[PDB]
Amino acid sequence: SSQAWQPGVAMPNLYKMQRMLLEKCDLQNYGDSATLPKGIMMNVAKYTQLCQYLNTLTLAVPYNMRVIHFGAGSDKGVAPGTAVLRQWLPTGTLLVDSDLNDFVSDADSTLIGDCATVHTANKWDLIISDMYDPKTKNVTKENDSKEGFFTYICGFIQQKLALGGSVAIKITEHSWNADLYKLMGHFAWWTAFVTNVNASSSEAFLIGCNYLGKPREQIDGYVMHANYIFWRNTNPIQLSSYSLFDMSKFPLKLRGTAVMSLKEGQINDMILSLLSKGRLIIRENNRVVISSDVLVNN
Amino acid sequence: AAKAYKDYLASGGQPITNCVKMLCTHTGTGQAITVTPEANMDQESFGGASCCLYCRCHIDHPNPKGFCDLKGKYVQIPTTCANDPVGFTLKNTVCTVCGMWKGYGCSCDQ
Numbered sequence: 496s497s498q499a500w501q502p503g504v505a506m507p508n509l510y511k512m513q514r515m516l517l518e519k520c521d522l523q524n525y526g527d528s529a530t531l532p533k534g535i536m537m538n539v540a541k542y543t544q545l546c547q548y549l550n551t552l553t554l555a556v557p558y559n560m561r562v563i564h565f566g567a568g569s570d571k572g573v574a575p576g577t578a579v580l581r582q583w584l585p586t587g588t589l590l591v592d593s594d595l596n597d598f599v600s601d602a603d604s605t606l607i608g609d610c611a612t613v614h615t616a617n618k619w620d621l622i623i624s625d626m627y628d629p630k631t632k633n634v635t636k637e638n639d640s641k642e643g644f645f646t647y648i649c650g651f652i653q654q655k656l657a658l659g660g661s662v663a664i665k666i667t668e669h670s671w672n673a674d675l676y677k678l679m680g681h682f683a684w685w686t687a688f689v690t691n692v693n694a695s696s697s698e699a700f701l702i703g704c705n706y707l708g709k710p711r712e713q714i715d716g717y718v719m720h721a722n723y724i725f726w727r728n729t730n731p732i733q734l735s736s737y738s739l740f741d742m743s744k745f746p747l748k749l750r751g752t753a754v755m756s757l758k759e760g761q762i763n764d765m766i767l768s769l770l771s772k773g774r775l776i777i778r779e780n781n782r783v784v785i786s787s788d789v790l791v792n793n
Numbered sequence: 794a795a796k797a798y799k800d801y802l803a804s805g806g807q808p809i810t811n812c813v814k815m816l817c818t819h820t821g822t823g824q825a826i827t828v829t830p831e832a833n834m835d836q837e838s839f840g841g842a843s844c845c846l847y848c849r850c851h852i853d854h855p856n857p858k859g860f861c862d863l864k865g866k867y868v869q870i871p872t873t874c875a876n877d878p879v880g881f882t883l884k885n886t887v888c889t890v891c892g893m894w895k896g897y898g899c900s901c902d903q
Protein backbone atom coordinates (compact mmCIF):
# COMPACT_ATOMS: atom_id res chain seq x y z
CA SER A 496 0.00 0.00 0.00
CA SER A 497 3.00 2.29 -0.65
CA GLN A 498 0.79 3.94 -3.27
CA ALA A 499 -0.91 5.91 -0.49
CA TRP A 500 2.20 8.11 -0.13
CA GLN A 501 2.31 8.76 -3.87
CA PRO A 502 0.33 11.77 -5.26
CA GLY A 503 -1.62 9.18 -7.24
CA VAL A 504 -1.43 6.06 -9.39
CA ALA A 505 -0.50 5.77 -13.07
CA MET A 506 -2.00 3.05 -15.25
CA PRO A 507 0.54 0.14 -15.30
CA ASN A 508 2.09 -0.69 -18.69
CA LEU A 509 0.71 -4.21 -18.82
CA TYR A 510 -2.87 -2.83 -18.66
CA LYS A 511 -2.11 -0.61 -21.68
CA MET A 512 -1.16 -3.74 -23.66
CA GLN A 513 -4.49 -5.56 -23.26
CA ARG A 514 -7.39 -5.74 -25.74
CA MET A 515 -10.40 -5.35 -23.45
CA LEU A 516 -14.03 -4.64 -24.34
CA LEU A 517 -15.58 -1.60 -22.66
CA GLU A 518 -17.52 -2.42 -19.50
CA LYS A 519 -19.35 -0.33 -16.92
CA CYS A 520 -17.04 1.27 -14.35
CA ASP A 521 -17.81 -0.14 -10.89
CA LEU A 522 -15.34 1.18 -8.29
CA GLN A 523 -15.05 -0.62 -4.94
CA ASN A 524 -14.21 2.67 -3.20
CA TYR A 525 -17.04 4.51 -5.02
CA GLY A 526 -18.54 6.71 -2.30
CA ASP A 527 -15.53 7.06 0.00
CA SER A 528 -13.80 10.44 0.45
CA ALA A 529 -10.23 11.29 1.42
CA THR A 530 -9.62 13.51 4.44
CA LEU A 531 -8.42 16.82 3.00
CA PRO A 532 -6.29 19.22 5.11
CA LYS A 533 -8.51 21.72 6.93
CA GLY A 534 -10.05 24.30 4.59
CA ILE A 535 -8.41 22.84 1.46
CA MET A 536 -10.83 22.26 -1.45
CA MET A 537 -10.81 19.20 -3.71
CA ASN A 538 -9.84 21.22 -6.81
CA VAL A 539 -6.68 22.50 -5.08
CA ALA A 540 -5.83 19.04 -3.70
CA LYS A 541 -6.41 17.37 -7.07
CA TYR A 542 -4.24 19.83 -9.01
CA THR A 543 -1.55 19.69 -6.34
CA GLN A 544 -1.30 15.91 -6.79
CA LEU A 545 -1.30 16.22 -10.59
CA CYS A 546 1.60 18.70 -10.43
CA GLN A 547 3.43 16.49 -7.89
CA TYR A 548 3.13 13.67 -10.42
CA LEU A 549 4.16 15.82 -13.41
CA ASN A 550 7.32 16.68 -11.42
CA THR A 551 8.44 13.04 -11.83
CA LEU A 552 8.24 13.13 -15.65
CA THR A 553 10.57 14.67 -18.27
CA LEU A 554 8.59 17.85 -18.94
CA ALA A 555 10.37 20.42 -21.09
CA VAL A 556 10.64 23.64 -19.08
CA PRO A 557 11.93 26.54 -21.25
CA TYR A 558 12.35 30.16 -20.26
CA ASN A 559 9.08 32.04 -20.78
CA MET A 560 7.30 28.68 -20.88
CA ARG A 561 3.74 28.87 -22.24
CA VAL A 562 0.93 27.07 -20.45
CA ILE A 563 -2.77 27.03 -21.35
CA HIS A 564 -5.49 25.73 -19.02
CA PHE A 565 -8.95 24.70 -20.29
CA GLY A 566 -12.11 24.30 -18.19
CA ALA A 567 -10.56 26.39 -15.39
CA GLY A 568 -13.73 28.03 -14.03
CA SER A 569 -15.33 26.69 -10.84
CA ASP A 570 -19.03 26.84 -9.91
CA LYS A 571 -18.21 29.65 -7.46
CA GLY A 572 -16.56 31.80 -10.16
CA VAL A 573 -12.89 31.35 -9.19
CA ALA A 574 -10.01 29.28 -10.60
CA PRO A 575 -8.42 26.99 -7.96
CA GLY A 576 -6.60 24.85 -10.53
CA THR A 577 -5.07 27.96 -12.13
CA ALA A 578 -3.89 29.11 -8.70
CA VAL A 579 -2.09 25.76 -8.20
CA LEU A 580 -0.57 25.86 -11.70
CA ARG A 581 0.80 29.38 -11.13
CA GLN A 582 2.24 28.23 -7.78
CA TRP A 583 3.87 25.23 -9.45
CA LEU A 584 5.15 26.90 -12.62
CA PRO A 585 8.37 28.99 -12.66
CA THR A 586 7.74 32.66 -11.91
CA GLY A 587 7.19 34.58 -15.14
CA THR A 588 5.64 31.58 -16.92
CA LEU A 589 2.91 32.72 -19.29
CA LEU A 590 -0.36 31.19 -18.07
CA VAL A 591 -3.64 31.52 -19.96
CA ASP A 592 -6.86 29.94 -18.74
CA SER A 593 -10.27 29.44 -20.30
CA ASP A 594 -13.84 28.30 -19.71
CA LEU A 595 -17.38 28.69 -21.10
CA ASN A 596 -18.52 30.99 -18.26
CA ASP A 597 -16.99 34.02 -16.53
CA PHE A 598 -14.68 33.55 -13.53
CA VAL A 599 -11.92 35.35 -11.61
CA SER A 600 -8.39 34.04 -12.20
CA ASP A 601 -4.71 34.48 -11.35
CA ALA A 602 -3.81 33.69 -14.98
CA ASP A 603 -2.02 36.29 -17.10
CA SER A 604 -5.06 36.18 -19.39
CA THR A 605 -8.53 34.58 -19.20
CA LEU A 606 -10.63 33.58 -22.25
CA ILE A 607 -14.40 33.14 -21.87
CA GLY A 608 -16.32 31.24 -24.59
CA ASP A 609 -16.04 28.04 -26.63
CA CYS A 610 -13.25 27.05 -29.04
CA ALA A 611 -14.98 28.42 -32.15
CA THR A 612 -14.68 31.92 -30.64
CA VAL A 613 -11.01 31.95 -29.57
CA HIS A 614 -7.88 31.76 -31.72
CA THR A 615 -4.09 31.96 -31.57
CA ALA A 616 -1.31 31.33 -34.09
CA ASN A 617 1.14 30.75 -31.19
CA LYS A 618 2.32 27.36 -29.96
CA TRP A 619 2.27 26.14 -26.35
CA ASP A 620 4.58 24.06 -24.16
CA LEU A 621 1.97 22.56 -21.82
CA ILE A 622 -1.79 22.06 -22.04
CA ILE A 623 -3.91 21.28 -18.96
CA SER A 624 -7.63 20.51 -19.29
CA ASP A 625 -10.28 20.07 -16.61
CA MET A 626 -13.04 20.51 -19.16
CA TYR A 627 -15.98 18.25 -18.32
CA ASP A 628 -19.72 18.34 -18.90
CA PRO A 629 -21.63 16.40 -16.16
CA LYS A 630 -24.51 15.83 -18.61
CA THR A 631 -22.22 13.56 -20.68
CA LYS A 632 -22.75 10.76 -18.18
CA ASN A 633 -25.75 8.69 -19.27
CA VAL A 634 -25.86 5.13 -17.91
CA THR A 635 -29.03 4.35 -19.89
CA LYS A 636 -27.20 4.60 -23.24
CA GLU A 637 -24.07 3.11 -24.75
CA ASN A 638 -20.81 4.74 -23.64
CA ASP A 639 -19.41 5.88 -27.01
CA SER A 640 -16.48 8.18 -27.80
CA LYS A 641 -17.48 11.80 -27.09
CA GLU A 642 -17.02 14.25 -29.99
CA GLY A 643 -17.52 17.79 -28.65
CA PHE A 644 -14.78 19.77 -26.91
CA PHE A 645 -12.57 16.67 -27.29
CA THR A 646 -12.34 17.13 -31.06
CA TYR A 647 -11.14 20.70 -30.42
CA ILE A 648 -8.62 19.46 -27.84
CA CYS A 649 -7.19 17.02 -30.42
CA GLY A 650 -7.09 19.78 -33.05
CA PHE A 651 -5.34 22.15 -30.63
CA ILE A 652 -2.69 19.55 -29.79
CA GLN A 653 -1.94 18.68 -33.43
CA GLN A 654 -1.80 22.35 -34.46
CA LYS A 655 -0.68 24.39 -31.44
CA LEU A 656 1.38 22.11 -29.19
CA ALA A 657 5.14 22.61 -29.58
CA LEU A 658 7.22 19.52 -30.32
CA GLY A 659 8.54 18.43 -26.92
CA GLY A 660 5.42 19.83 -25.19
CA SER A 661 3.15 17.84 -22.86
CA VAL A 662 -0.53 17.58 -21.97
CA ALA A 663 -2.72 16.52 -19.05
CA ILE A 664 -6.36 16.10 -20.11
CA LYS A 665 -9.15 15.14 -17.72
CA ILE A 666 -11.26 12.11 -18.72
CA THR A 667 -13.82 9.96 -16.91
CA GLU A 668 -15.69 6.72 -17.62
CA HIS A 669 -18.15 8.64 -19.83
CA SER A 670 -16.09 11.73 -20.72
CA TRP A 671 -13.52 10.39 -23.19
CA ASN A 672 -12.54 10.40 -26.85
CA ALA A 673 -10.98 7.66 -29.00
CA ASP A 674 -8.89 10.09 -31.07
CA LEU A 675 -7.36 11.60 -27.93
CA TYR A 676 -6.11 8.17 -26.80
CA LYS A 677 -4.77 7.57 -30.31
CA LEU A 678 -2.94 10.92 -30.13
CA MET A 679 -1.26 9.74 -26.92
CA GLY A 680 0.84 7.56 -29.26
CA HIS A 681 2.27 10.78 -30.77
CA PHE A 682 4.16 11.44 -27.50
CA ALA A 683 7.43 9.91 -26.25
CA TRP A 684 5.46 8.50 -23.32
CA TRP A 685 1.90 8.56 -21.98
CA THR A 686 -0.29 7.35 -19.14
CA ALA A 687 -3.63 7.72 -17.42
CA PHE A 688 -3.03 9.20 -13.96
CA VAL A 689 -5.46 8.99 -11.02
CA THR A 690 -5.03 11.41 -8.10
CA ASN A 691 -5.07 9.74 -4.68
CA VAL A 692 -7.55 12.33 -3.34
CA ASN A 693 -10.08 11.55 -6.09
CA ALA A 694 -9.47 7.77 -6.42
CA SER A 695 -13.16 7.04 -5.70
CA SER A 696 -13.96 8.62 -9.10
CA SER A 697 -13.49 7.22 -12.64
CA GLU A 698 -11.67 10.49 -13.36
CA ALA A 699 -8.13 10.38 -14.67
CA PHE A 700 -5.70 12.69 -16.42
CA LEU A 701 -4.50 11.45 -19.82
CA ILE A 702 -0.89 12.58 -19.79
CA GLY A 703 1.13 12.83 -23.00
CA CYS A 704 4.78 13.57 -22.28
CA ASN A 705 7.02 15.14 -24.98
CA TYR A 706 5.05 15.60 -28.23
CA LEU A 707 6.74 14.12 -31.32
CA GLY A 708 4.20 15.34 -33.92
CA LYS A 709 3.92 11.84 -35.40
CA PRO A 710 2.71 8.39 -34.23
CA ARG A 711 5.50 6.65 -32.32
CA GLU A 712 3.00 3.85 -31.64
CA GLN A 713 -0.45 2.97 -33.02
CA ILE A 714 -3.16 3.14 -30.34
CA ASP A 715 -6.80 2.12 -30.79
CA GLY A 716 -8.69 4.60 -28.59
CA TYR A 717 -11.78 2.39 -28.17
CA VAL A 718 -9.62 -0.45 -26.87
CA MET A 719 -7.44 1.77 -24.71
CA HIS A 720 -10.41 3.33 -22.92
CA ALA A 721 -11.70 -0.20 -22.28
CA ASN A 722 -8.22 -1.06 -20.95
CA TYR A 723 -8.39 2.00 -18.67
CA ILE A 724 -11.77 0.95 -17.23
CA PHE A 725 -10.56 -2.64 -16.81
CA TRP A 726 -7.62 -1.31 -14.76
CA ARG A 727 -9.86 0.91 -12.60
CA ASN A 728 -12.39 -1.93 -12.07
CA THR A 729 -9.81 -4.47 -10.93
CA ASN A 730 -7.46 -2.19 -8.98
CA PRO A 731 -9.03 -0.39 -5.99
CA ILE A 732 -6.98 2.71 -5.20
CA GLN A 733 -6.94 3.74 -1.54
CA LEU A 734 -8.07 7.36 -1.10
CA SER A 735 -5.15 9.37 0.27
CA SER A 736 -4.17 12.99 0.88
CA TYR A 737 -0.79 12.03 2.38
CA SER A 738 1.29 13.69 -0.39
CA LEU A 739 -0.46 17.04 0.27
CA PHE A 740 1.35 17.43 3.60
CA ASP A 741 4.86 17.65 2.07
CA MET A 742 5.16 20.59 -0.32
CA SER A 743 8.91 21.13 0.11
CA LYS A 744 9.73 19.82 -3.40
CA PHE A 745 6.57 21.10 -5.10
CA PRO A 746 7.86 23.83 -7.52
CA LEU A 747 8.54 22.67 -11.09
CA LYS A 748 12.33 22.75 -11.48
CA LEU A 749 13.58 25.28 -14.00
CA ARG A 750 15.47 23.38 -16.69
CA GLY A 751 15.99 26.26 -19.11
CA THR A 752 15.05 23.88 -21.93
CA ALA A 753 16.22 25.02 -25.36
CA VAL A 754 13.60 26.40 -27.75
CA MET A 755 14.27 26.46 -31.49
CA SER A 756 12.41 26.67 -34.79
CA LEU A 757 13.28 23.68 -36.98
CA LYS A 758 11.87 22.93 -40.43
CA GLU A 759 9.93 19.65 -40.68
CA GLY A 760 12.71 18.26 -42.90
CA GLN A 761 15.25 19.04 -40.15
CA ILE A 762 13.48 16.96 -37.49
CA ASN A 763 15.76 13.91 -37.59
CA ASP A 764 16.21 10.96 -35.22
CA MET A 765 18.64 12.84 -32.97
CA ILE A 766 16.18 15.74 -32.63
CA LEU A 767 13.47 13.19 -31.73
CA SER A 768 15.89 11.83 -29.13
CA LEU A 769 16.21 15.29 -27.54
CA LEU A 770 12.44 15.85 -27.66
CA SER A 771 11.87 12.44 -26.01
CA LYS A 772 14.14 13.32 -23.05
CA GLY A 773 12.45 16.67 -22.42
CA ARG A 774 15.59 18.51 -23.58
CA LEU A 775 14.09 20.43 -26.49
CA ILE A 776 11.07 22.49 -27.52
CA ILE A 777 10.36 23.22 -31.17
CA ARG A 778 8.28 26.31 -31.93
CA GLU A 779 8.79 29.96 -32.81
CA ASN A 780 9.04 32.51 -30.01
CA ASN A 781 6.93 35.41 -31.30
CA ARG A 782 4.82 37.73 -29.15
CA VAL A 783 1.86 35.79 -27.81
CA VAL A 784 -1.42 37.05 -29.22
CA ILE A 785 -4.83 35.56 -28.44
CA SER A 786 -7.93 36.58 -30.40
CA SER A 787 -11.53 36.55 -29.19
CA ASP A 788 -14.45 36.53 -31.70
CA VAL A 789 -17.70 38.40 -31.08
CA LEU A 790 -20.89 37.68 -33.03
CA VAL A 791 -22.39 41.07 -33.83
CA ASN A 792 -26.13 41.49 -34.35
CA ASN A 793 -28.83 44.11 -33.84
CA ALA B 794 -14.27 49.73 -1.23
CA ALA B 795 -13.93 48.69 2.42
CA LYS B 796 -16.52 51.37 3.24
CA ALA B 797 -19.46 49.15 2.25
CA TYR B 798 -17.85 45.78 3.09
CA LYS B 799 -16.95 46.86 6.64
CA ASP B 800 -20.56 47.99 7.19
CA TYR B 801 -21.75 44.70 5.68
CA LEU B 802 -19.68 42.80 8.27
CA ALA B 803 -20.55 45.31 11.03
CA SER B 804 -24.27 44.70 10.49
CA GLY B 805 -23.58 40.95 10.51
CA GLY B 806 -23.16 39.98 6.85
CA GLN B 807 -21.50 36.78 5.63
CA PRO B 808 -17.77 37.21 4.77
CA ILE B 809 -16.91 36.47 1.13
CA THR B 810 -16.13 32.76 0.83
CA ASN B 811 -14.51 30.48 -1.74
CA CYS B 812 -11.18 32.26 -1.41
CA VAL B 813 -8.67 29.77 -2.84
CA LYS B 814 -6.47 28.46 -0.02
CA MET B 815 -3.21 26.93 -1.21
CA LEU B 816 -1.18 23.99 0.06
CA CYS B 817 2.27 25.11 1.23
CA THR B 818 5.05 24.26 3.71
CA HIS B 819 4.12 27.04 6.16
CA THR B 820 7.85 27.79 6.50
CA GLY B 821 7.76 30.86 4.22
CA THR B 822 9.04 34.42 4.74
CA GLY B 823 5.61 35.51 5.99
CA GLN B 824 5.45 38.58 3.72
CA ALA B 825 1.95 39.86 2.87
CA ILE B 826 1.84 39.55 -0.95
CA THR B 827 4.29 37.30 -2.82
CA VAL B 828 4.88 35.68 -6.23
CA THR B 829 4.46 32.27 -4.59
CA PRO B 830 2.90 31.13 -1.24
CA GLU B 831 5.05 32.37 1.67
CA ALA B 832 2.82 31.57 4.65
CA ASN B 833 4.72 31.06 7.92
CA MET B 834 3.56 28.73 10.73
CA ASP B 835 0.97 31.35 11.77
CA GLN B 836 -0.43 32.08 8.30
CA GLU B 837 -2.44 30.68 5.40
CA SER B 838 -1.73 31.52 1.75
CA PHE B 839 -4.52 32.26 -0.72
CA GLY B 840 -4.67 32.84 -4.46
CA GLY B 841 -4.66 36.64 -4.81
CA ALA B 842 -7.47 37.22 -7.32
CA SER B 843 -9.95 35.25 -5.16
CA CYS B 844 -9.17 37.55 -2.20
CA CYS B 845 -9.61 40.79 -4.16
CA LEU B 846 -12.95 42.58 -3.70
CA TYR B 847 -12.48 44.38 -7.03
CA CYS B 848 -11.78 41.20 -9.01
CA ARG B 849 -14.55 39.26 -7.24
CA CYS B 850 -17.19 41.98 -7.77
CA HIS B 851 -15.99 42.61 -11.35
CA ILE B 852 -15.58 46.33 -10.60
CA ASP B 853 -12.72 48.67 -11.51
CA HIS B 854 -9.69 48.82 -9.19
CA PRO B 855 -8.92 52.02 -7.19
CA ASN B 856 -5.87 53.00 -9.24
CA PRO B 857 -5.48 55.44 -12.21
CA LYS B 858 -3.96 52.57 -14.22
CA GLY B 859 -6.35 50.02 -12.70
CA PHE B 860 -3.55 47.75 -11.45
CA CYS B 861 -4.40 44.87 -9.11
CA ASP B 862 -1.72 44.08 -6.52
CA LEU B 863 -3.34 40.69 -5.69
CA LYS B 864 -4.24 39.07 -9.04
CA GLY B 865 -1.51 36.59 -10.07
CA LYS B 866 0.10 36.69 -6.59
CA TYR B 867 -0.47 35.00 -3.22
CA VAL B 868 -1.69 36.76 -0.09
CA GLN B 869 -0.67 35.58 3.38
CA ILE B 870 -3.41 35.90 6.01
CA PRO B 871 -2.96 35.27 9.78
CA THR B 872 -4.55 31.89 10.51
CA THR B 873 -6.74 33.66 13.10
CA CYS B 874 -8.26 35.81 10.32
CA ALA B 875 -8.27 33.19 7.53
CA ASN B 876 -12.08 32.95 7.77
CA ASP B 877 -12.30 36.31 5.93
CA PRO B 878 -9.31 37.06 3.61
CA VAL B 879 -11.09 39.77 1.61
CA GLY B 880 -11.92 41.70 4.78
CA PHE B 881 -8.42 41.33 6.22
CA THR B 882 -6.73 42.63 3.05
CA LEU B 883 -9.08 45.62 2.87
CA LYS B 884 -8.70 46.65 6.53
CA ASN B 885 -4.93 46.11 6.75
CA THR B 886 -2.05 47.69 4.82
CA VAL B 887 1.34 46.25 3.77
CA CYS B 888 4.63 47.74 5.02
CA THR B 889 6.55 49.35 2.14
CA VAL B 890 9.80 48.60 3.98
CA CYS B 891 9.74 44.90 4.95
CA GLY B 892 6.66 43.92 2.91
CA MET B 893 4.89 42.60 6.03
CA TRP B 894 1.37 43.46 7.26
CA LYS B 895 1.22 46.30 9.80
CA GLY B 896 0.57 44.81 13.26
CA TYR B 897 0.93 41.30 11.79
CA GLY B 898 4.64 40.84 11.09
CA CYS B 899 6.06 44.33 10.52
CA SER B 900 8.40 45.31 13.37
CA CYS B 901 9.98 48.40 11.80
CA ASP B 902 8.70 50.42 14.78
CA GLN B 903 11.06 49.07 17.46
Ligand SMILES: *C(Cc1cc(C(F)(F)F)nc(O)n1)c1ccc(Cl)cc1Cl
Binds near residue numbers: 794797850852
Ligand atom coordinates in the same frame (compact mmCIF):
# COMPACT_ATOMS: atom_id res chain seq x y z
C1 LIG C 1 -19.03 41.41 -4.76
C2 LIG C 1 -20.36 41.96 -4.26
C3 LIG C 1 -20.41 43.40 -4.71
C4 LIG C 1 -21.03 43.75 -5.91
C5 LIG C 1 -21.04 45.09 -6.30
C6 LIG C 1 -21.70 45.51 -7.58
F1 LIG C 1 -22.71 44.70 -7.86
F2 LIG C 1 -22.15 46.75 -7.45
F3 LIG C 1 -20.81 45.46 -8.55
N1 LIG C 1 -20.44 46.01 -5.51
C7 LIG C 1 -19.83 45.65 -4.35
O1 LIG C 1 -19.24 46.59 -3.58
N2 LIG C 1 -19.82 44.36 -3.96
C8 LIG C 1 -19.08 39.89 -4.90
C9 LIG C 1 -18.44 39.09 -3.95
C10 LIG C 1 -18.47 37.71 -4.06
C11 LIG C 1 -19.13 37.11 -5.13
CL1 LIG C 1 -19.18 35.33 -5.30
C12 LIG C 1 -19.77 37.91 -6.08
C13 LIG C 1 -19.74 39.29 -5.97
CL2 LIG C 1 -20.57 40.27 -7.22
Ligand SMILES: *[C@@H](Cc1cc(C(F)(F)F)nc(O)n1)c1ccc(Cl)cc1Cl
Binds near residue numbers: 877
Ligand atom coordinates in the same frame (compact mmCIF):
# COMPACT_ATOMS: atom_id res chain seq x y z
C1 LIG D 1 -8.84 38.90 12.10
C2 LIG D 1 -9.00 39.56 13.48
C3 LIG D 1 -8.58 38.66 14.62
C4 LIG D 1 -9.44 37.67 15.09
C5 LIG D 1 -9.03 36.86 16.15
C6 LIG D 1 -9.92 35.77 16.69
F1 LIG D 1 -9.47 34.60 16.28
F2 LIG D 1 -9.91 35.81 18.01
F3 LIG D 1 -11.16 35.93 16.27
N1 LIG D 1 -7.82 37.06 16.72
C7 LIG D 1 -6.99 38.03 16.25
O1 LIG D 1 -5.78 38.19 16.84
N2 LIG D 1 -7.37 38.83 15.22
C8 LIG D 1 -9.65 39.72 11.12
C9 LIG D 1 -9.26 41.04 10.87
C10 LIG D 1 -9.98 41.83 9.98
C11 LIG D 1 -11.10 41.31 9.34
CL1 LIG D 1 -12.03 42.34 8.20
C12 LIG D 1 -11.50 40.01 9.58
C13 LIG D 1 -10.78 39.21 10.47
CL2 LIG D 1 -11.34 37.53 10.74
Ligand SMILES: Oc1nc(/C=C/c2ccc(Cl)cc2Cl)cc(C(F)(F)F)n1
Binds near residue numbers: 614
Ligand atom coordinates in the same frame (compact mmCIF):
# COMPACT_ATOMS: atom_id res chain seq x y z
O1 LIG E 1 -6.98 28.34 -31.72
C1 LIG E 1 -7.21 28.45 -30.38
N1 LIG E 1 -8.00 27.54 -29.76
C2 LIG E 1 -8.24 27.68 -28.44
C3 LIG E 1 -9.04 26.76 -27.62
C4 LIG E 1 -9.55 25.60 -28.01
C5 LIG E 1 -10.21 24.80 -26.96
C6 LIG E 1 -9.95 23.44 -26.98
C7 LIG E 1 -10.48 22.60 -26.02
C8 LIG E 1 -11.26 23.13 -25.01
CL1 LIG E 1 -11.95 22.04 -23.76
C9 LIG E 1 -11.51 24.49 -24.96
C10 LIG E 1 -10.97 25.34 -25.93
CL2 LIG E 1 -11.33 27.09 -25.82
C11 LIG E 1 -7.64 28.70 -27.73
C12 LIG E 1 -6.84 29.60 -28.39
C13 LIG E 1 -6.22 30.70 -27.59
F1 LIG E 1 -6.82 30.77 -26.42
F2 LIG E 1 -4.95 30.43 -27.41
F3 LIG E 1 -6.36 31.84 -28.23
N2 LIG E 1 -6.63 29.46 -29.71
Ligand code: NA
Binds near residue numbers: 580581583585829
Ligand atom coordinates in the same frame (compact mmCIF):
# COMPACT_ATOMS: atom_id res chain seq x y z
NA1 NA F 1 5.18 29.54 -9.18
Ligand code: NA
Binds near residue numbers: 882883884885886
Ligand atom coordinates in the same frame (compact mmCIF):
# COMPACT_ATOMS: atom_id res chain seq x y z
NA1 NA G 1 -5.99 47.34 2.52
Ligand SMILES: [Zn+2]
Binds near residue numbers: 845846847848862863
Ligand atom coordinates in the same frame (compact mmCIF):
# COMPACT_ATOMS: atom_id res chain seq x y z
ZN1 LIG H 1 -8.16 42.57 -8.19
Ligand SMILES: [Zn+2]
Binds near residue numbers: 900
Ligand atom coordinates in the same frame (compact mmCIF):
# COMPACT_ATOMS: atom_id res chain seq x y z
ZN1 LIG I 1 8.11 46.88 8.15
